[PDB]
Design an enzyme around this catalytic site. Structure first.
Site, PDB file in Angstrom:
ATOM      1  N   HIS B  40     -67.261 -24.840 -24.611  1.00 35.32           N
ATOM      2  CA  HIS B  40     -65.822 -24.930 -24.911  1.00 35.32           C
ATOM      3  C   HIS B  40     -65.547 -25.141 -26.391  1.00 35.32           C
ATOM      4  O   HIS B  40     -64.406 -24.882 -26.825  1.00 35.32           O
ATOM      5  CB  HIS B  40     -64.977 -25.893 -24.007  1.00 35.32           C
ATOM      6  N   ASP B  84     -71.438 -25.744 -19.104  1.00 34.67           N
ATOM      7  CA  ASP B  84     -70.798 -25.957 -20.409  1.00 34.67           C
ATOM      8  C   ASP B  84     -71.789 -26.114 -21.548  1.00 34.67           C
ATOM      9  O   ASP B  84     -72.126 -27.256 -21.976  1.00 34.67           O
ATOM     10  CB  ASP B  84     -69.830 -27.144 -20.334  1.00 34.67           C
ATOM     11  N   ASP B 171     -67.073 -45.036 -24.765  1.00 38.73           N
ATOM     12  CA  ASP B 171     -67.132 -43.638 -24.278  1.00 38.73           C
ATOM     13  C   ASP B 171     -67.170 -42.657 -25.457  1.00 38.73           C
ATOM     14  O   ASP B 171     -66.832 -43.007 -26.615  1.00 38.73           O
ATOM     15  CB  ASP B 171     -65.855 -43.385 -23.464  1.00 38.73           C
ATOM     16  N   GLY B 175     -63.325 -34.726 -30.284  1.00 36.75           N
ATOM     17  CA  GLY B 175     -64.173 -34.678 -31.481  1.00 36.75           C
ATOM     18  C   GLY B 175     -65.683 -34.673 -31.219  1.00 36.75           C
ATOM     19  O   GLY B 175     -66.496 -34.369 -32.157  1.00 36.75           O
ATOM     20  N   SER B 177     -67.314 -33.539 -28.400  1.00 41.51           N
ATOM     21  CA  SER B 177     -67.831 -32.344 -27.667  1.00 41.51           C
ATOM     22  C   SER B 177     -68.957 -31.589 -28.346  1.00 41.51           C
ATOM     23  O   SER B 177     -68.868 -31.357 -29.557  1.00 41.51           O
ATOM     24  CB  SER B 177     -66.768 -31.309 -27.374  1.00 41.51           C
ATOM     25  N   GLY B 178     -69.969 -31.234 -27.608  1.00 37.79           N
ATOM     26  CA  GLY B 178     -71.107 -30.478 -28.135  1.00 37.79           C
ATOM     27  C   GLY B 178     -72.256 -31.344 -28.615  1.00 37.79           C
ATOM     28  O   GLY B 178     -73.380 -30.831 -28.715  1.00 37.79           O
TER      29      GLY B 178
END
Ligand code: CA
Lengths: 58, 223
Positions: B40, B84, B171, B175, B177-178
């Site tokens: 994504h 993903d 958590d 920002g 992501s990946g």
């Protein structure tokens, strides 16, 4: 013009920081907001120009 | 990362920033030309930045390299967020040093209760907005499939897992992501999705990297 142009901006569940545009009917312009990268709603544009063309007038 | 700490400079040598005019995503350096990230996070005109700490100033340790290819997993589902996962081939090979190192792919999957490191430049507020300059780190354990499927009914596939704290406060967030979830030196996870960030009874959700290894090795080798 339309009614999806009145919806509030949707970040969504994904955790990217992607800056996109939404029509702010209160302000009467396109603004930027953070889009998480998935599951976009229709009030979400890649540029201000796209946004003004689709919504500007709502 | 909500609830984390400052990793300290260049201490997560396999963390990368994905840049498109600004930091939009994370990634993990898997060898000198290959980065793995989230599907994504797919954009055109990516630059990868290696050897970052303060993503806002030039510290002298960086390598800014553009992506030659971006390969999103052939079965990525953009509705369900299944598979993903994406590979990014750098235009040229990075120089590997101490500030820039790659991460080993796993041999096996991690179990529940494995403590992992999650790192990133994403939002540090659960409600509100605060994006840091320097890289942020969090030790969060791998949650059990059963509790993951209770936290998100009907939404976890066999390629997902949950990590974090059912009480909230710690958590990964927008920002992040990946970026990596690294457990005992091995890359177990990719920061993917959740219900907001650091909410009680809604842990973060991650791509289960251990299912992909074969796919990754063969994709790197034939591109
Ligand atoms: Ca820097």
């Amino acid at each position: 013009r339309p009614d999806f142009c009145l919806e509030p901006p949707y970040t969504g569940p994904c955790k990217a920081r992607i800056i996109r545009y939404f029509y702010n009917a209160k302000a009467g312009l396109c603004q930027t907001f953070v889009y998480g990268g998935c599951r976009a709603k229709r009030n979400n544009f890649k540029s201000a120009e796209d946004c003004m063309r689709t919504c500007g007038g709502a | 990362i909500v609830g984390g700490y400052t990793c300290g400079a260049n201490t997560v040598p396999y963390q990368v920033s994905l840049n498109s005019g600004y930091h939009f995503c994370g990634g993990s350096l898997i060898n000198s030309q290959w980065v793995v990230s989230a599907a994504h996070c797919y954009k055109s005109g990516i630059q990868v930045r290696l050897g970052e700490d303060n993503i806002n100033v030039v510290e002298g340790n960086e390598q800014f390299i553009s992506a030659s290819k971006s390969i999103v997993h052939p079965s990525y589902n953009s509705n369900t967020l299944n598979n993903d996962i994406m590979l990014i081939k750098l235009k040229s090979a990075a120089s590997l040093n101490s500030r820039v190192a790659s991460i080993s792919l796993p041999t096996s999957c991690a179990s529940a209760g494995t403590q992992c490191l999650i790192s990133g430049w994403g939002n540090t507020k659960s409600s509100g907005t605060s994006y840091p300059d320097v890289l942020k780190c969090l030790k969060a354990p791998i949650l059990s499939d059963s509790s993951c499927k209770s936290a998100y009914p009907g939404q976890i596939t066999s390629n997902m897992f949950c990590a974090g704290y059912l009480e909230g406060g710690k958590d990964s967030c927008q920002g992040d992501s990946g970026g990596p979830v690294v457990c005992s030196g091995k890359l177990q996870g990719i920061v993917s999705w959740g219900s907001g960030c650091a909410q009680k009874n809604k842990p973060g959700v991650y791509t289960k990297v251990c299912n992909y290894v074969s796919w990754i090795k063969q994709t790197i080798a034939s591109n």
